[PDB]
Amino acid sequence: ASTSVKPIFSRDMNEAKRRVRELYRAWYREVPNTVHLFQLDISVKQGRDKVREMFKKNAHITDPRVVDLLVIKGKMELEETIKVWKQRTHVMRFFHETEAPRPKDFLSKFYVGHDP
Amino acid sequence: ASKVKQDMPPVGGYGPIDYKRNLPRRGLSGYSMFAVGIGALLFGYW
Amino acid sequence: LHHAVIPHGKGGRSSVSGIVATVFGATGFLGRYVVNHLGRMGSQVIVPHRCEPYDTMHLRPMGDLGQIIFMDWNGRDKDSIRRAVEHSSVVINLVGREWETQNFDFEDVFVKIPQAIAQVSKEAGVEKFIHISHLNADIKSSSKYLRSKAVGEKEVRETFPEATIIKPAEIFGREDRFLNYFANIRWFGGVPLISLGKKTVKQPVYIVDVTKGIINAIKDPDARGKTFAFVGPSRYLLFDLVQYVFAVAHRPFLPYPLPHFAYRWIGRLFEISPFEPWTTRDKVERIHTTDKILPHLPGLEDLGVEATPLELKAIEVLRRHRTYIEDVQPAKTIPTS
Amino acid sequence: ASATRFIQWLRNWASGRDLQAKLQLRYQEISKRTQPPPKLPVGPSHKLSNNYYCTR
Amino acid sequence: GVRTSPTGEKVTHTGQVYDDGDYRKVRFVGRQKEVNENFAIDLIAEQPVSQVGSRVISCDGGGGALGHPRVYINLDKETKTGTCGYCGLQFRQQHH
Amino acid sequence: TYKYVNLREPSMDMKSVTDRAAQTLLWTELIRGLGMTLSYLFREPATINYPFEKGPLSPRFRGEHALRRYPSGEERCIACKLCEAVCPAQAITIEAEPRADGSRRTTRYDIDMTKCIYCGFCQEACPVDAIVEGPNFEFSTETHEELLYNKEKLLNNGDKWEAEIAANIQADYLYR
Amino acid sequence: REKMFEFYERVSGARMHAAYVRPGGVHQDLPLGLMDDIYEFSKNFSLRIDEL
Amino acid sequence: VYDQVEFDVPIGSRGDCYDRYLCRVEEMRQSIRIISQCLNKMPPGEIKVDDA
Amino acid sequence: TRPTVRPRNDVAHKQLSAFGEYVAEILPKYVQQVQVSCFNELEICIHPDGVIPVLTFLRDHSNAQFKSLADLTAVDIPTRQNRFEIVYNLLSLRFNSRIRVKTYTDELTPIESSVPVYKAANWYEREIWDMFGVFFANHPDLRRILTDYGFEGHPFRKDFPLSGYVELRYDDEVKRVVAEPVELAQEFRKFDLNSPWEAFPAYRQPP
Amino acid sequence: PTVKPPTARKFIWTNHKFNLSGTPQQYVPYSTTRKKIQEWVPPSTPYK
Amino acid sequence: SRGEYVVAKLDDLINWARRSSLWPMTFGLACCAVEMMHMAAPRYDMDRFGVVFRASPRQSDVMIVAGTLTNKMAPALRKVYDQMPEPRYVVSMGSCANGGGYYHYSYSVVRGCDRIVPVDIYVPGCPPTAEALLYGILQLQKKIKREKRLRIWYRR
Numbered sequence A: 001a002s003t004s005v006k007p008i009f010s011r012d013m014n015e016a017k018r019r020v021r022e023l024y025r026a027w028y029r030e031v032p033n034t035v036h037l038f039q040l041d042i043s044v045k046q047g048r049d050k051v052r053e054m055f056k057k058n059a060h061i062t063d064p065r066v067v068d069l070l071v072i073k074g075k076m077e078l079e080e081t082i083k084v085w086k087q088r089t090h091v092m093r094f095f096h097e098t099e100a101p102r103p104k105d106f107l108s109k110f111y112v113g114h115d116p
Numbered sequence B: 001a002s003k004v005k006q007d008m009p010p011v012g013g014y015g016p017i018d019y020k021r022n023l024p025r026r027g028l029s030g031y032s033m034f035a036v037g038i039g040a041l042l043f044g045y046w
Numbered sequence C: 001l002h003h004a005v006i007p008h009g010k011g012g013r014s015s016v017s018g019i020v021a022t023v024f025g026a027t028g029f030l031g032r033y034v035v036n037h038l039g040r041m042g043s044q045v046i047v048p049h050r051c052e053p054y055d056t057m058h059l060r061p062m063g064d065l066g067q068i069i070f071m072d073w074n075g076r077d078k079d080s081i082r083r084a085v086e087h088s089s090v091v092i093n094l095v096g097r098e099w100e101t102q103n104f105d106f107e108d109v110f111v112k113i114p115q116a117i118a119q120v121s122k123e124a125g126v127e128k129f130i131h132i133s134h135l136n137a138d139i140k141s142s143s144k145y146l147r148s149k150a151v152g153e154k155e156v157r158e159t160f161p162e163a164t165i166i167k168p169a170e171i172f173g174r175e176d177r178f179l180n181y182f183a184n185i186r187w188f189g190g191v192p193l194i195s196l197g198k199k200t201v202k203q204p205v206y207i208v209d210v211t212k213g214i215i216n217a218i219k220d221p222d223a224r225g226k227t228f229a230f231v232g233p234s235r236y237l238l239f240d241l242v243q244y245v246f247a248v249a250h251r252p253f254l255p256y257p258l259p260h261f262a263y264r265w266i267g268r269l270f271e272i273s274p275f276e277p278w279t280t281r282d283k284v285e286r287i288h289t290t291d292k293i294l295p296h297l298p299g300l301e302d303l304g305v306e307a308t309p310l311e312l313k314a315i316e317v318l319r320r321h322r323t324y325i326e327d328v329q330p331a332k333t334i335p336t337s
Numbered sequence D: 001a002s003a004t005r006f007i008q009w010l011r012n013w014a015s016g017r018d019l020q021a022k023l024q025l026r027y028q029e030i031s032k033r034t035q036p037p038p039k040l041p042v043g044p045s046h047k048l049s050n051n052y053y054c055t056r
Numbered sequence E: 001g002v003r004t005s006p007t008g009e010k011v012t013h014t015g016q017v018y019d020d021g022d023y024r025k026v027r028f029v030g031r032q033k034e035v036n037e038n039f040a041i042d043l044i045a046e047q048p049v050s051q052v053g054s055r056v057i058s059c060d061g062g063g064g065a066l067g068h069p070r071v072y073i074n075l076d077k078e079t080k081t082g083t084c085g086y087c088g089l090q091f092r093q094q095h096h
Numbered sequence F: 001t002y003k004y005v006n007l008r009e010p011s012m013d014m015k016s017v018t019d020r021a022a023q024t025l026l027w028t029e030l031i032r033g034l035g036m037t038l039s040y041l042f043r044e045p046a047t048i049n050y051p052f053e054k055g056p057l058s059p060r061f062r063g064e065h066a067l068r069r070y071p072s073g074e075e076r077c078i079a080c081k082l083c084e085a086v087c088p089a090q091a092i093t094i095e096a097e098p099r100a101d102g103s104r105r106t107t108r109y110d111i112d113m114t115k116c117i118y119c120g121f122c123q124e125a126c127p128v129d130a131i132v133e134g135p136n137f138e139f140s141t142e143t144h145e146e147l148l149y150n151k152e153k154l155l156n157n158g159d160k161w162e163a164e165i166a167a168n169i170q171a172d173y174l175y176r
Numbered sequence G: 001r002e003k004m005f006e007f008y009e010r011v012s013g014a015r016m017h018a019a020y021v022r023p024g025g026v027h028q029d030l031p032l033g034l035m036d037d038i039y040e041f042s043k044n045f046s047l048r049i050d051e052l
Numbered sequence H: 001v002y003d004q005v006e007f008d009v010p011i012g013s014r015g016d017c018y019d020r021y022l023c024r025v026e027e028m029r030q031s032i033r034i035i036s037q038c039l040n041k042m043p044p045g046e047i048k049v050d051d052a
Numbered sequence I: 001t002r003p004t005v006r007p008r009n010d011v012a013h014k015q016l017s018a019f020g021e022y023v024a025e026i027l028p029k030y031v032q033q034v035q036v037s038c039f040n041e042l043e044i045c046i047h048p049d050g051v052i053p054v055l056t057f058l059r060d061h062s063n064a065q066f067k068s069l070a071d072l073t074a075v076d077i078p079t080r081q082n083r084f085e086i087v088y089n090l091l092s093l094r095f096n097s098r099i100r101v102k103t104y105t106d107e108l109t110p111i112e113s114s115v116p117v118y119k120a121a122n123w124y125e126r127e128i129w130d131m132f133g134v135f136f137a138n139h140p141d142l143r144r145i146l147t148d149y150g151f152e153g154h155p156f157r158k159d160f161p162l163s164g165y166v167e168l169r170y171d172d173e174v175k176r177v178v179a180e181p182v183e184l185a186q187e188f189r190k191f192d193l194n195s196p197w198e199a200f201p202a203y204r205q206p207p
Numbered sequence J: 001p002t003v004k005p006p007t008a009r010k011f012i013w014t015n016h017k018f019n020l021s022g023t024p025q026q027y028v029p030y031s032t033t034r035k036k037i038q039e040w041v042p043p044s045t046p047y048k
Numbered sequence K: 001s002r003g004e005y006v007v008a009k010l011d012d013l014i015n016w017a018r019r020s021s022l023w024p025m026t027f028g029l030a031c032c033a034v035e036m037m038h039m040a041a042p043r044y045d046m047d048r049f050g051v052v053f054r055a056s057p058r059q060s061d062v063m064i065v066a067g068t069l070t071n072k073m074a075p076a077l078r079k080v081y082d083q084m085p086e087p088r089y090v091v092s093m094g095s096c097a098n099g100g101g102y103y104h105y106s107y108s109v110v111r112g113c114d115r116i117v118p119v120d121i122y123v124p125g126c127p128p129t130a131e132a133l134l135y136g137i138l139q140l141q142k143k144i145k146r147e148k149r150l151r152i153w154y155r156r
């Protein structure tokens, strides 16, 4: 039927989850080299927490093909970092250091502008 | 009436335009060059 | 609010913050950070400068088109001050010098100039005035710098009663003359210290913390007419701090004792330079002044700023001083009050 | 164009060509910078009859 | 023409002028406010009315193809002149 | 039709082999290259003495923009906005209203000269020859803000350059 | 190249980005005297190639 | 109108940088040869389609 | 003939039509539609499973010999279930002819890499992945090629905004180039240009 | 121009100016339109 | 024999040397680099002004930004600027470098190189003619001639 689709790499979520955990391990081990190689001012703990935050925001996916593309993109991102195709500016773009904290409560948004 | 006037080639066209490669022949033969060089050495040696 | 100063946008480069700020002393260490924070949110910044225009070029990329305006000014010309403030809603005085020149002494930079700016700003109808003083300002201090700070602070409060006075501790940062000062002592074999760096406790504050505190003061109606003290989170012994500084810079640390009299001649010896001295008597007296504890004054937390630990930012400053495992060894902190 | 005959001979011999007949600098052979006005022709659709747009 | 506001700033031919409390006039300190002093509204008014002897007259702005699209102006009303919508020249029918 | 650029087999007789040996050992073809650079040394250089001398241009040259007037001094621009619609870079910003005398005239006419690609489409589109690209190309500035032209700047350019602009239009309008 | 930039400028008013060839033909007809100057340029160009 | 002009296509034999250099230099000569025909065969008429 | 009207070439139109039927007869498993345009361009529309077989036949068959891959690109059509149209433009030097082969895919369905057939396809498929987000299976080295490192999104999708979501500037406080949400001093001005009157009756669609 | 002088116009500059960038005569951009929204001005007297 | 006089004449000397020996680092990014190359070519011969054609970034005194600065390229341009020894100047050549130009509204383009580096001269055009660029370089020379580094130092 219309639910019978072509897979990317994983035929079901359990196969997809294995790839997620393999990608997470690769990122986890890369952070110490990245902090040293790019001479970042963040700690290894900060880098690894940022990695965990990025994986968590996609925890609600249940479509294996979507998970496949997330892993494919995550691996491209890792390769850019390991090969030093990125510069220090690209690595630090995950941390939004120059962006002021936008308000989140109703009142604070009400005082500043019109956006919800 | 004023006649039409626009940029056009002159009556009879333009003259010939060269385009083929032209690298002229110069100098002496190999025999002549080596003869002059060897003659210079001998006079210098003498 | 006049219709041109109503804030619009989302706080970015092309937004309208509604702030129109004249920043005196914008070309120095603290000034560059203040202008950058004003520029980020789309403020109109007027930058009077005494220096060459070439020396202000680093400020130009900090604002959207037309948002940074440069004017000539002279500290002794009240008309040049008036031209620069008469359209502003806030005036920030960051003017200062760590040494005296033939043309300007500590009384000029810290007393006469701040009073002239305050008086002209009041007459021009400027609403807010922010004046940077010093935590250790005091008329009994051996440092002439710190004595002038105390006198100037009193005159500003009399001239512009609603002024916000900020009294920071020694400030560290990339362009600071604090951590970089200690790092550059290594450039000579001797590493002198009054006593042995003991009897001096320091509470340095991070440059960005001071900048956020100043910016938050501009936006805070409560802050008008108050005096703040901006200090870091941890108090340190001057010996531990310098030892930590050398450890982060991967340098060999060789302490050796000295009293003030033998520490004043070295200060005098480099005061002979026709440029920024490496050190001076007054600089040594300030460095060896214990940082005052002033619990009757509000601080960074009253303005919603979390003081940044020195250990989190020392590498940022001192990485360039390294010769070419990160044990680091955090410096020992005096027990908190 | 203003080179002496000696310099003309020298550079012609060095290059192996008669450079003077094809100078790479322009003199008076170029067209006037003021020209008489043109009168440009009109295309085939400039007609007063048998010219309905649906035929073209 | 170019008049001035109480603050001393010149008023443009479009009527623009920063008011007393507008900070934006700080951009003119140590520099100048570019103002064009040939107000077209005053210049076109200096032109005299053409008297013509027909009900309809045409204007192309002068200079043929260097002017504006040719328009035809009705001159039946005797309580006003006929004005060219493109260049502002005025025409009036003589007698009738 | 086609030709071979490099399909000649060298002859292998003494006369020819020795000619090539002479070239290898006596550097003859290298000496020939020296002759060409020596010949150029004695040619007059092509350099003009800028700014006292100027590169030639034509009446069609597309340079700094300007707004024009009629001989009476009335503005030509009647705020049709054809220029703003056609501008490939969206470099033109226009606002308009009835003037005091009822005329249809702009109240804003801005060109961001740092968005402009100097294509000349605006002057092609203009039905009344109001906006033109004049002959000035020497208007570099020290600040970005100086290149954001408003209507006052553009009218001043028209009054400044009209003498030359009119002559250039007179020279090319029959090609348009 | 500088002289061929002049041909670009004389037909289009720009030395490089002419925007001259357009769907339907070209923007403007050649100015009078241009073909003569192109002839004079082309007459001497093969010598320039030979020097190269 | 490229099918109304006469020119030759230069062809290499070794497929290396030198043969590609020779092809480009020879293509410049052919362009001069084509320009010569364009100057002579330039017709009169309008320069953009007569369909407004 | 009419001086302003492009002349038709009926011989090429017939030749391309006959060859189009030829292709459809030989690969019925994959060919979904064959059409020839009024300016004589042949398009073969195929099921995406037929990429390698159809391209291989067109390259290697004696009566085809489309040795050159002129171009490979994608088109985004959001109204379709399979929004992405993948277009292969091939050239035959032997028969001095061109052909276009088209297939489709959605955001989650991989297409087979044609690098085995045309090594030219390597970078073209990286560009399609970068600009449209279409994944190509078994590509030797699939990664972004045109966008900035770490760039998020696929900017040639019809729903990606013209000016993007982020912009760059140098920040003096952190001494580096930083990325921030896009703000424009002048918003891009959308123009509504379409005439409300139909221009081309020949292309009218049923109500 | 000594042979073909330019046509005279009343509005043409009689005094040409060179590039004024970097001087006090430099051009400074600004919006040439008037304020678009008029704000309500409260009465200058107490309610009662 | 005042110090004002000596400082005044010493300023003129160093200003003369610096403007008379301007070594550019041309950042040829796109089309504008072609016109920059025509400024070095024989007709204009920038070298005759003391402006050497191809100079390494280590010895350069001025960076010419000739073309579109994309986001992917902005970090590399800032790196070159940071490595230039002082005194250093930036000339922004052409619409793209000035403010984005034709590509101002693109997702991938920096809207003017003055978001990345401070710019001393803006040269308008798309591209500016070789002569327009030369005019801009000569404008930078006069800007250097006006510098008063030593006079300001003397009055500190």
Ligand SMILES: CCCCCCCCCCCCCCCCCC(=O)OC[C@H](COP(=O)(O)OCCN)OC(=O)CCCCCCCCCCCCCCCCC
Pocket: B037, B038, B041, F024, F025, F026, F027, F030, F031
């Ligand atoms: C009686 C018998 C007596 C016995 C003695 C008789 C001896 C005479 C016969 C021998 C003649 C010897 C000639 C000496 C020159 C050396 C020759 C040589 O080595 O040149 C060949 C070299 C390689 O040539 P290539 O074609 O690339 O490859 C060949 C190898 N597979 O290629 C080169 O070296 C080319 C040069 C490379 C550098 C090019 C840049 C410089 C060119 C301009 C130089 C101008 C002339 C300089 C003269 C200065 C004089 C002060």
Ligand SMILES: CCCCCCCCCCCCCCCCCC(=O)OC[C@H](COP(=O)(O)OCCN)OC(=O)CCCCCCCCCCCCCCCCC
Pocket: B025, B026, B027, B028, B029, B030, D014, D016, F019, F023, F026, F027, F028, F029, F031, F032, F033, F034, F035, F036, F038
């Ligand atoms: C800064 C500039 C200073 C100059 C100021 C003005 C004065 C200019 C004087 C320079 C003289 C050299 C310039 C002219 C060179 C051009 C002449 C030429 O092109 O001849 C080419 C000729 C033919 O070569 P080709 O076509 O390959 O033929 C091969 C088979 N026949 O090839 C030949 O025939 C070459 C024959 C000579 C081969 C000699 C090999 C080198 C031997 C070294 C001896 C050096 C002696 C001179 C050194 C100086 C001492 C006086």
Ligand SMILES: NC(=O)C1=CN([C@@H]2O[C@H](COP(=O)(O)OP(=O)(O)OC[C@H]3O[C@@H](n4cnc5c(N)ncnc54)[C@H](OP(=O)(O)O)[C@@H]3O)[C@@H](O)[C@H]2O)C=CC1
Pocket: C024, C025, C026, C027, C028, C029, C030, C031, C049, C050, C051, C074, C075, C093, C094, C095, C096, C097, C098, C104, C109, C132, C133, C134, C135, C167, C168, C169, C170, C171, C172, C177, C178
């Ligand atoms: N940095 C610290 O550790 C602390 C700083 N402060 C105070 O903060 C303020 C700024 O600190 P910082 O920015 O480090 O000082 P800087 O020396 O870094 O900058 C000083 C500023 O004052 C200007 N200035 C100095 N003298 C004069 C003068 N005579 N006439 C006109 N302008 C003058 C300078 O301009 P030019 O560039 O033209 O010389 C410069 O812009 C000062 O008031 C300082 O006392 C307070 C506590 C600690």
Ligand code: SF4
Pocket: F083, F086, F087, F088, F089, F090, F091, F092, F111, F115, F116, F117, F118, F119, F120, F121, F122, F123, F133
């Ligand atoms: S020249 Fe082109 S880009 Fe510039 S304003 Fe005119 S139409 Fe727009």
Ligand code: SF4
Pocket: F076, F077, F078, F079, F080, F081, F082, F083, F084, F094, F122, F125, F126, F127, F128, F129, F130, F131
């Ligand atoms: S300049 Fe011309 S095209 Fe543009 S609005 Fe004015 S009249 Fe219309």
Ligand code: SF4
Pocket: K030, K031, K032, K033, K066, K067, K068, K093, K094, K095, K096, K097, K101, K102, K125, K126, K127, K128
């Ligand atoms: S400004 Fe114009 S010529 Fe220069 S790089 Fe941009 S598009 Fe090309």
Ligand SMILES: [Zn+2]
Pocket: E059, E060, E061, E068, E084, E085, E086, E087, E088, E089
């Ligand atoms: Zn009219």
